[PDB]
Amino acid sequence: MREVISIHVGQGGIQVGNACWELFCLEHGIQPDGQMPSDGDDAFNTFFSETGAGKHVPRAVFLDLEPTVIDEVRTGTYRQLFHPEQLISGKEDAANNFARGHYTIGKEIVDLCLDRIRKLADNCTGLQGFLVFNSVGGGTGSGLGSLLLERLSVDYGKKSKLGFTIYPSPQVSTAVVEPYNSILSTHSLLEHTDVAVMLDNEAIYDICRRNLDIERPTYTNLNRLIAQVISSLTASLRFDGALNVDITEFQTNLVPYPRIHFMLSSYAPIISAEKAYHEQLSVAEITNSAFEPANMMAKCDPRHGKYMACSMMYRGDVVPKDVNASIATIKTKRTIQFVDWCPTGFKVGINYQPPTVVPGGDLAKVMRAVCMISNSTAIAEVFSRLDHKFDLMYAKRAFVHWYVGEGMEEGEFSEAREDLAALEKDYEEVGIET
Amino acid sequence: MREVISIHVGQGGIQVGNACWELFCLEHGIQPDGQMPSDKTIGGGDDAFNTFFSETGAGKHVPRAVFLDLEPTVIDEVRTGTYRQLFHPEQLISGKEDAANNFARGHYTIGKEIVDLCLDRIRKLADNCTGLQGFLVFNSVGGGTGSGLGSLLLERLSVDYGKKSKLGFTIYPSPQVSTAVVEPYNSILSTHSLLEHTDVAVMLDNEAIYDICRRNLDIERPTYTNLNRLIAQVISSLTASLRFDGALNVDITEFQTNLVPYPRIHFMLSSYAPIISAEKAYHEQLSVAEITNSAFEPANMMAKCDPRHGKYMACSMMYRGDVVPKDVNASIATIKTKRTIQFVDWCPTGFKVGINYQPPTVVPGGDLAKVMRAVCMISNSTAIAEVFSRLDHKFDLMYAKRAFVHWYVGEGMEEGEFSEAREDLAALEKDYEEVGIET
Amino acid sequence: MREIVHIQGGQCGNQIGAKFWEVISDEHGIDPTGTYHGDSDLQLERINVYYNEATGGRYVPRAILMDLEPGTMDSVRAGPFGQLFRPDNFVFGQTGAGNNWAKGHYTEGAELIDSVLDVVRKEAEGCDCLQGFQITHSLGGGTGSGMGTLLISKVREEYPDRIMETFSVVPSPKVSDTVVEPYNATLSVHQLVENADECMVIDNEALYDICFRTLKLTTPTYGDLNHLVSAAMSGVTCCLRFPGQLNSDLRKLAVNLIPFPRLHFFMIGFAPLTSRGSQQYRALTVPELTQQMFDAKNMMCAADPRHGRYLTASALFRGRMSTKEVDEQMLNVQNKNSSYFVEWIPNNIKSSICDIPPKGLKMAVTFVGNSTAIQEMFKRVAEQFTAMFRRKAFLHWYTGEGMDEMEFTEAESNMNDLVSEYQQYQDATA
Amino acid sequence: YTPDLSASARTFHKDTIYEKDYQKHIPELGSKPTVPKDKARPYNEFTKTYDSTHMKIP
Amino acid sequence: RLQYLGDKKSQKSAAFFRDTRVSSCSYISLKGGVPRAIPYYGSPTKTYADTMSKSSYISSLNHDTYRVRPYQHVGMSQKLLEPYHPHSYRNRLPVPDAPPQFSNA
Ligand SMILES: Nc1nc2c(ncn2[C@@H]2O[C@H](COP(=O)(O)OP(=O)(O)OP(=O)(O)O)[C@@H](O)[C@H]2O)c(=O)[nH]1
Ligand SMILES: Nc1nc2c(ncn2[C@@H]2O[C@H](COP(=O)(O)OP(=O)(O)OP(=O)(O)O)[C@@H](O)[C@H]2O)c(=O)[nH]1
Ligand SMILES: Nc1nc2c(ncn2[C@@H]2O[C@H](COP(=O)(O)OP(=O)(O)O)[C@@H](O)[C@H]2O)c(=O)[nH]1
Ligand SMILES: [Mg+2]
Ligand SMILES: [Mg+2]
């Protein structure tokens, strides 16, 4: 009776979502052409909507002002799955101009998208929430992604938000103008979303390299692991389990403060079959594996600062007694410390369905694993690094004009560093003892 | 009510002294002008800054320091420096002509015309003090002006005040690389006057600093300032107990009675570690023995000398922070047990332990920095007499040809005095050889 | 869908054009007759960008060939690939230019501007959403620089929003093909600063140096120089016609290549190049590609990028390569070549990914970078005028068009400080 | 004693289809997906949530 | 800008090389009646202010020597850039003191 509508925007968002849906699609036995072979079960409703004749139309929205990436899907094998008129594609791209994607070229399409999303909610009634994926270091996503973010808050209001962002790579970047469009995107999403994540692409490579030992990976595989991240997220929503964690039970157990809604997530284990033969893959050992910063999904070391929250969703064949026995072990180590006022911040959930592997995947088949979304003051560094960048290219007014001529006023830029400056102090003030 | 007066003569002291005072005012929260900001938490807690400063009654603070140098350029920099108001304008006595590394000028021809103002200066400075523990003198032996001003000045305080304890942190020339070409002469004669008129001598040869620098500091392009931020942090813990609470008080006075077994043997060397910095700060822990073990490491001494070549007579060590000393005995316990570390036959115990509570503060950010550990020794080893050999042999290497002889003879210093320095200096080795001989 | 147009003028501007359509016709699998015979279904999806639909299933380029002399346009159509261009789109008079910048802008070239402005407007109106104009011409020639620029100047008064390109072959002092080579280019150059959004400078010396040195060719012919310049063209819009992991239209490059609004003069380079006798003996892969592309000599500008510092740079890797390797080489090149990716804009290199390799090669890249090293070219090349101006004349061949002195003394007043704008943004620091 | 045999030497692989125990269970790329077994939330009472009888309450 | 331009005023001076058909540049100085001709495009010229031969430095050792050189450590937000070296100054493990216990004990 629970469904979630997904919003995938930005070249990554549709591409990053590209990999994830198959895992959503494959795990329910639905064929690529929208049919299931004759065989709880068949309650795909958690992501899909049965017409009544067999077809399963996902409740996802595709937006991009640039037809190219969009064109890759309707010409692909998955052409017959998605609803045809539900794929909104723009004519002229934003070309990485946040103002362009947020002031001039996106407004004329907002009504159509806002129209489509509203429709998809009519069929369902117990909608848990929405998942929106947008890359901060992207032009079209930065603006369009924000604008949709702003509207729903007045379109629905109180309804929660669960958005998966991908901040710029800590050191090896693709574009050059990312710091500008990155900050403003944060400003809009800073106080118009409920839960965020740290999806720096540098994290996957080392995880893909250290674990998968693939020194020449591409962007397609990176999404695969990210797709795995989501799968464990809704694991308790369409599978029987003794302890279940739902989206509506997120602000209660992961939001120490209304402002602070930016944490980092991770999953384990990333192991190919070639090394898992000589491995025990014991629940206890996997427990520490997702805590070492080497396996984290963000280029931040939690040893820099304290820990504010840690929520665990166990998926596979683990047993509660070992988890508590394993959970206690973490409270002994002195390399990782909590905050003075965080007596209880652990959340352990057990679901009976172990991971499912799509054909052609890199991860091998195992018996246990873990995914994590933890609250630690370590988030300070990532923004701090941006803070240094933001001023560097504005103290000489570099690239300012390109933004000014598309309708963005000059006074908008300052607040972004103003809001960010306040944000940094917000995290620091919640890391000291009383 | 305890006050200490630091005397600086020579550029090396002019610069090296700068690092300590700048950190001090940074340690005590003193602004460049010397005005303490009232906005800081609390303020005026007892008299902690009284050790180095002197209150004017309302406003700035006056550190008890004196600057001397014969060449204006060094002096002129301080007066126009960003801390041009931290020092008393009348305390910056400056001459007209440099000594240029010759003893006879700064001690017999032109150095005698300057001792008047400074000596009067300290008297006024000493008048303010009521519990003067002593005086601190910083200067480099590698110059006639230094040794010339050090030699002539120091003796005066011996008679002017008498029993007042005086500490001298000399900086001897390196074993192989020396700034000047006449480095041995000034050092060879310099030890003479200070031979019976200096209380403590801390072997701090520069090149050993780089070796530590080249092994821990890891700055392939260090500048003297890199050296300065090393020594300056050293003094902070040395007198640490003199300005902060400690379990077992360690004062300036109870050192000569702990580091002077014989009247002539008063040369000492010290060790301290670790270092704080900019590519080793996973800050995380390690334990004490590491700090103690590195303390006794042959390459960790502030001298290019190996205590493996000598024996240990007395020791003193200083810490800071807040833990239970109980590790000290065991940490020391692992020290003597080491076979590489040995004591003399007539030394039942040769360790002096003094620990304070104030942690280490660093300028932002230093060259050292806000280290987590702080272990420093005040101990003596016979090996330093050797590595006297470097100075002794090379000094011999020259006079045989009488090279550069006339330079000192041009100021009225007789040709015969050169003999005495060899005599007394030669006699210096005899006791060390006899001091280490077992009964 | 977001198609573009091309206006190439002047004999120099025409000859480069003669091959680009030769180059483009291959990529989309089109032979001279105008019929489709391609191989891959992706070959044809994005074909509308450069051609218009026509009866009989045949395609024609959206090109306007503009010249003032009769020989050139008479030359092209009778040669191979002579059928593609629409006959109507041609325009020419009966006078000619004669490398007289004066005649090409007031007397003769002015009177005919009606037709070219007549034809250009119509074709642009046809496209669903005009992406922009790319103008190729030789400022060293008469009609290109003289009359060609005006069309660049005029078109701004009608289409303020679209973006411009210029593949201008600025002549170099080493080997000058004309004595007028240094009263036609700049006077077209001066007007170029206030209207041209971007500028590509291709120096002849680079081509000959490029051909002799790496290609190891013995006796090249202009057919050799033309194609290498043309290959660069395919790189600019290459990602605009085929799908890829990371796409970037000609707009996206414009954002990440011009540090300040007016400093819009770049230098480009094409890699990889190897001789016929050397192909087998070289292992071609991603990491040695960077060595060639970032080498200064590979640049098509006579200026040496080692004379200055790079402001911003972009590279479009051609050939199917993963995402990891592309980024990492950037990190090392930035750190290793930090001295130049100067210091007040971190990571000034942009990245692009496309998955269609040039036919017959498995890895190649296209370079578009901004570096103050362009300052030398606007300092030395013909720098003699500053000393040679003092004597006031050659006038009688240019006042024949009403041009006065004030039009010249004013330009440096407007033109004095390009480097004095470029130079300043080379020593500044936070 | 000659070198034993070139064909029996250590070969980085041999002719045994699945040369190792590794790939015996590696998933087939083209295999059709299999519907999951009886492992999910058992469903009775929320039936009375989506029915068209809830509205019109008054 | 900078760039170049033409000259364009011919029938002006020198009275002889005027309209002498010969590609002879503009006209002939003859102010002194001696050598160098007018050295078709330039450079917007320069003045002493434009080229001042910037000094290698502007300041002295002590200013940097005693610079006002916060204490960086694990996290603590900004970290100043410095040359890379793997033997370590501020990214490695610390060591925390073994200090005393006050009072008579
Ligand atoms: N981790 C990851 N990031 C991706 C992937 N594809 C694209 N990105 C992100 O996309 C950024 C590059 O900019 P674009 O993808 O062009 O941004 P955009 O979505 O096109 O936004 P617009 O330019 O306005 O159209 C990179 O910095 C990446 O962070 C991917 O496959 N994996
Ligand atoms: N380690 C270290 N030594 C210094 C520093 N500044 C000066 N010195 C010492 O000063 C010595 C140079 O001798 P001189 O230049 O003759 O100085 P001087 O002894 O006062 O003699 P004059 O300069 O003529 O007045 C060097 O050998 C150093 O040991 C410094 O910043 N660090
Ligand atoms: N690279 C290259 N340069 C050319 C070509 N054709 C002409 N040029 C250059 O153009 C210059 C002469 O241009 P010009 O004939 O005055 O142009 P026009 O007045 O339009 O005919 C010469 O210096 C050549 O270097 C060509 O096909 N390739
Ligand atoms: Mg895009
Ligand atoms: Mg001197």
Residue numbers in the entry:
A (entry chain KM): 1 to 39, 45 to 439
B (entry chain NM): 1 to 439
C (entry chain KN): 1 to 430
D (entry chain 0G): 123 to 180
E (entry chain 5D): 19 to 123
List sentences from the manuscript.
We obtained the DMT structures from the Tetrahymena MEC17-KO and K40R mutants at 4.5 and 3.5 Å resolution, respectively. Our first observation is that all the decoration of the MIPs appears intact in MEC17-KO and K40R DMT compared to that of WT. Therefore, our cryo-EM analyses indicate that acetylation does not affect DMT and MIP assembly. Our comparison of (acetylated and non-acetylated) αK40 and αK60 loops did not reveal significant structural differences. We observed only minor changes in the inter-PF angles in the A-tubule. This analysis suggests that the inter-PF rotation angle varies significantly more in acetylation mutants K40R and MEC17-KO.
At the core, motile and primary cilia share the same cytoskeletal framework, the axoneme, composed of a bundle of nine outer doublet microtubules (DMTs).
